[PDB]
Design an enzyme around this catalytic site. Structure first.
Site, PDB file in Angstrom:
ATOM      1  N   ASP A   1      -8.814  -0.859  -7.778  1.00 53.97           N
ATOM      2  CA  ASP A   1      -8.034  -1.065  -6.832  1.00 53.97           C
ATOM      3  C   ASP A   1      -6.964  -2.616  -6.877  1.00 53.97           C
ATOM      4  O   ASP A   1      -6.505  -2.801  -6.227  1.00 53.97           O
ATOM      5  CB  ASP A   1      -8.563  -0.777  -5.785  1.00 53.97           C
ATOM      6  CG  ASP A   1      -8.014  -1.376  -4.343  1.00 53.97           C
ATOM      7  OD1 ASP A   1      -7.075  -0.412  -3.989  1.00 53.97           O
ATOM      8  OD2 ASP A   1      -8.521  -0.848  -2.848  1.00 53.97           O
TER       9      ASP A   1
ATOM     10  N   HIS B   1      -6.439   7.584  -2.719  1.00 55.17           N
ATOM     11  CA  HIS B   1      -6.787   6.710  -1.652  1.00 55.17           C
ATOM     12  C   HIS B   1      -6.475   5.329  -0.761  1.00 55.17           C
ATOM     13  O   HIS B   1      -7.503   4.422  -0.215  1.00 55.17           O
ATOM     14  CB  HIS B   1      -7.609   5.003  -2.438  1.00 55.17           C
ATOM     15  CG  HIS B   1      -7.101   4.406  -3.318  1.00 55.17           C
ATOM     16  ND1 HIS B   1      -6.094   4.190  -4.309  1.00 55.17           N
ATOM     17  CD2 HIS B   1      -6.789   2.723  -2.815  1.00 55.17           C
ATOM     18  CE1 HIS B   1      -5.036   3.107  -4.119  1.00 55.17           C
ATOM     19  NE2 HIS B   1      -6.065   2.377  -3.315  1.00 55.17           N
ATOM     20  N   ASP B   2      -5.236   5.339  -0.909  1.00 55.75           N
ATOM     21  CA  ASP B   2      -4.171   4.903   0.349  1.00 55.75           C
ATOM     22  C   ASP B   2      -3.445   5.404   0.889  1.00 55.75           C
ATOM     23  O   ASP B   2      -2.449   5.413   1.316  1.00 55.75           O
ATOM     24  CB  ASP B   2      -3.903   3.709  -0.166  1.00 55.75           C
ATOM     25  CG  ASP B   2      -4.747   2.620   0.036  1.00 55.75           C
ATOM     26  OD1 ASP B   2      -5.873   2.068   0.585  1.00 55.75           O
ATOM     27  OD2 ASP B   2      -4.316   1.387  -1.482  1.00 55.75           O
TER      28      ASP B   2
ATOM     29  N   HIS C   1       0.587  -1.428  -0.056  1.00 58.69           N
ATOM     30  CA  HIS C   1      -0.161  -0.064   0.216  1.00 58.69           C
ATOM     31  C   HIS C   1       0.583   0.815  -0.370  1.00 58.69           C
ATOM     32  O   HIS C   1       1.297   2.016   0.465  1.00 58.69           O
ATOM     33  CB  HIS C   1      -0.762   0.135   1.605  1.00 58.69           C
ATOM     34  CG  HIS C   1      -1.930  -1.089   1.170  1.00 58.69           C
ATOM     35  ND1 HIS C   1      -2.107  -2.405   2.264  1.00 58.69           N
ATOM     36  CD2 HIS C   1      -3.218  -0.625  -0.016  1.00 58.69           C
ATOM     37  CE1 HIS C   1      -3.296  -2.867   1.265  1.00 58.69           C
ATOM     38  NE2 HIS C   1      -3.765  -2.108   0.187  1.00 58.69           N
TER      39      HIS C   1
ATOM     40  N   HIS D   1       1.656   1.952  -5.978  1.00 62.07           N
ATOM     41  CA  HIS D   1       0.656   1.720  -5.905  1.00 62.07           C
ATOM     42  C   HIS D   1      -0.629   1.917  -6.589  1.00 62.07           C
ATOM     43  O   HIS D   1      -1.659   1.836  -7.178  1.00 62.07           O
ATOM     44  CB  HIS D   1      -0.076   0.316  -4.502  1.00 62.07           C
ATOM     45  CG  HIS D   1      -1.609   0.007  -4.593  1.00 62.07           C
ATOM     46  ND1 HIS D   1      -2.250  -0.551  -5.116  1.00 62.07           N
ATOM     47  CD2 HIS D   1      -2.196   1.018  -3.593  1.00 62.07           C
ATOM     48  CE1 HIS D   1      -3.482  -0.641  -4.687  1.00 62.07           C
ATOM     49  NE2 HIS D   1      -3.677   0.547  -3.910  1.00 62.07           N
TER      50      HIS D   1
END
Ligand SMILES: Cn1ccc2ncnc(Oc3ccc(Nc4nc5ccccc5[nH]4)cc3)c21
Ligand SMILES: [Mg+2]
Ligand SMILES: [Zn+2]
Length: 315
Positions: free
Chosen positions: A220, A109-110, A71, A75
């Site tokens: 994702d 998003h991470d 993550h 990514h």
């Protein structure tokens, strides 16, 4: 750092390859930030954001990704690329504001991911689990994005209207929350229902939100849609991190589920096949049904599934 980024031009030999779903950013580490710039220019326009503010944003997003095995910064860009390709193959279906928001969301998003699951943080009473009860990391991820946007010279939506600002933040909010895999199942079940009943309407905002949610999940997990050598190497990164979470439970004197147990290394292929069948296939299958041009993702997912079969069967 952000000074040299504005000067960057993508090598011409990658103009057509970057448009492909199965494109692997892997061997272009120092081009990654400029690749995100490229994609945003092509999908939203060059005079969409002020370049200075956009480059400041990307660099700040980069630094706020922790050096964890999966993550991480890589990514983020990978998920952002998958989203790009989806949007490029579905030109008219999405508005100008949605394209801006979704690409930003995928990159963010991470953010500040610690390498631990929501399950871990909730079990061991983490301050973030105390703050957000459900979708723990995802609400933090979005929180992080807001913080970065509210930095000086980082507000990339400053030129948008007051009304347009609160709309794109909602698009971003929902897209990031949707990357909670726990929410995916309910979403995809609802979307399959609507398809077979024919009640799916893209004028319907809540229907639009659901479709977007699925796109987030599909982006994702897009590591499974790469060519086998790439996918296998990404599998190594995921488990390294899962196993590191497993070790942290062992240090606390608690046995973790085999997925995160490194002593269960042999059962990885079986775990993978199960995951492809239960989660990955239905995802891209449903996405193909809604957005037919996204078919190469499903095709690519089927290819890797059969590769894990060869592993299990020993071939
Ligand atoms: C999140 N993610 C994003 C891309 C991607 N590609 C592959 N795997 C991913 O995550 C996993 C990882 C593992 C499992 N299951 C499992 N069962 C096991 C049983 C025993 C041993 C290991 C086991 N592992 C499910 C999903 C991915
Ligand atoms: Mg996440
Ligand atoms: Zn992710």
């Amino acid at each position: 750092e952000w000074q040299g980024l504005m000067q960057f031009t993508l090598p011409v030999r990658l103009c057509k390859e970057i448009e492909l779903f199965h494109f692997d950013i892997g061997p272009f580490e120092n081009m990654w930030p400029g690749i995100f710039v490229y994609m945003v220019h092509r999908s939203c326009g060059t005079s969409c954001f002020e370049l200075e503010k956009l480059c400041r944003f990307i660099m700040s997003v980069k630094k706020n990704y922790r050096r964890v095995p999966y993550h991480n910064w890589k990514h983020a860009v990978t998920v952002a690329h998958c989203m790009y390709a989806i949007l490029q193959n579905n030109h008219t279906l999405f508005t100008d504001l949605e394209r801006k928001g979704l690409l930003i969301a995928c990159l963010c998003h991470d953010l500040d991911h610690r390498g631990f699951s929501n399950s871990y943080l909730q079990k061991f009473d983490h301050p973030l689990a105390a703050l957000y009860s459900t979708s723990t990391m995802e609400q933090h991820h979005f929180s992080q994005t807001v913080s970065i946007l509210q930095l000086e010279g980082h507000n990339i939506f400053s030129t948008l209207s007051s009304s347009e600002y609160e709309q794109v933040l909602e698009i971003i909010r929902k897209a990031i929350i949707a990357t909670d895999l726990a929410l995916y199942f309910g979403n995809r079940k609802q979307l399959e229902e609507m398809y077979q009943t024919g009640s799916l309407n893209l004028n319907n905002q809540s229907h639009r939100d659901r479709v977007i949610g699925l796109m987030m999940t599909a982006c994702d997990l897009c590591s499974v849609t790469k060519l086998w050598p790439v996918t296998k190497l990404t599998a190594n990164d995921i488990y390294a991190e899962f196993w590191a979470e497993g070790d942290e439970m062992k240090k606390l004197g608690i046995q973790p589920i085999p997925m995160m147990d490194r002593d269960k290394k042999d059962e990885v292929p079986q775990g993978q096949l199960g995951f492809y069948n239960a989660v990955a296939i239905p995802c891209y299958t449903t996405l193909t049904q809604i957005l037919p041009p996204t078919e190469p993702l499903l095709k690519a997912c089927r290819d890797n599934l059969s590769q894990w079969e060869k592993v299990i069967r020993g071939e």
